[PDB]
């Protein structure tokens, strides 16, 4: 039953001082630093996670470190808005423009009548 010690001069069990126990090829246990759990991108409209993107630390998303396909979604507002939210936005835009046209033509007809 080997007991372990911190590998760094951090001596307090804070969120940024997490570790895992790994068995080395030398037959001994040792600590290894593990990154804090991070939530991935989230859709502001629905509040649910954005699909197709892994949950990494902000610096792990850097272009030089992560492939483009991993940090992008091939759709309008891809990676920012969920599919359902984008569909709702498109439908709302179209219907609101149509109703604006209807209001304009109704006003023109009323003006012509009077």
């Amino acid at each position: 039953v080997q007991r372990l010690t911190y590998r760094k001069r951090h001596s307090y069990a804070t969120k940024s001082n997490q570790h895992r126990v790994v068995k080395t090829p030398g037959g001994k246990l040792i600590y290894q630093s593990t990154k804090k759990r991070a939530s991935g991108p989230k859709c502001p409209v629905t509040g649910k996670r954005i699909q197709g993107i892994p949950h990494l630390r902000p610096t792990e998303y850097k272009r030089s470190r992560l492939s483009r396909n991993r940090r992008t979604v091939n759709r309008a507002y891809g990676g920012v808005l969920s599919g359902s939210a984008v569909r709702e936005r498109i439908i709302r835009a179209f219907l609101v423009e149509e109703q604006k046209i209807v209001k304009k033509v109704l006003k023109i007809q009323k003006a012509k009548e009077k």
């Binding site: 709702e88 439908i91 709302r92 219907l95 149509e98």
Partner: protein, 97 residues
């Protein structure tokens, strides 16, 4: 009364309950009348109205929420909208216009 006619349609007519089925009937032109409750989301209501206008199908605004519409239909679940494919013994399609 609208409720009595709806009950008669339920017991002797053909109908579909729900947004997806309502859109399907409007696309297929099988529906003859669309009923929308007050509870229906504004965007969904606008989309249903646009579909009905494209299909030349009448739309009736039920004087109640989805719960009341479901209760009037005789169901134990909420009904946001419904389509009347064929009124058996009722005359809603004739009375409403």
């Amino acid at each position: 009364s609208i409720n009595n006619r709806l009950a008669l349609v339920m017991k002797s007519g053909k109908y579909s309950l729900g947004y997806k089925t309502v859109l399907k009937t409007l696309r297929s032109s099988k529906g003859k009348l669309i009923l929308i409750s007050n509870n229906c989301p504004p965007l969904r209501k606008s989309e249903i109205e646009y579909y009905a206008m494209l299909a030349k199908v009448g739309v009736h605004h039920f004087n109640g929420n989805n719960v009341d519409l479901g209760t009037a239909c005789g169901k134990y679940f909420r009904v946001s909208c419904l389509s009347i494919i064929d009124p058996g013994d009722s005359d809603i399609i004739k009375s409403l216009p």
